[PDB]
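Need the bound structure for FE3-S4 cluster, inputs here:
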Amino acid sequence: AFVVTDNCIKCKYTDCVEVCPVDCFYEGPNFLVIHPDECIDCALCAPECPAQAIFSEDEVPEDMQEFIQLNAELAEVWPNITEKKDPLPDAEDWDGVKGKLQHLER
Ligand code: SF4
Ligand code: F3S
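Answer from helper R.:
Posting the output first, comments after.
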């Protein structure tokens, strides 16, 4: 499974959903998650993220390990997103800020 981590929060470009063959991205107010049972690890979305927030599960940085289980839980409650849309409005002010998890909205 591929995992979305911290830098997506408050950027949410959605470029990643274009390339997904199985549509396994689920949408929250300011973050996207990948559903781990649905992902086929084709790895096509990781190059398409401008925030470089997507990682193969087995390459999630040590300090972002929490995001693996967060993707799994929030995927069960958020709605499927299958079309790109515009980035959040201030997305590049926040691209690259660290510690954005304290800003996640359910
Ligand atoms: S690795 Fe492939 S199947 Fe998984 S979210 Fe990315 S594009 Fe979709
Ligand atoms: S910022 Fe987030 S919405 Fe997709 S393009 Fe990157 S994982």
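Comments: The helical segments are 66-77, 91-94. Residues 1-106 form a domain with the Alpha-Beta Plaits fold (CATH 3.30.70.20).
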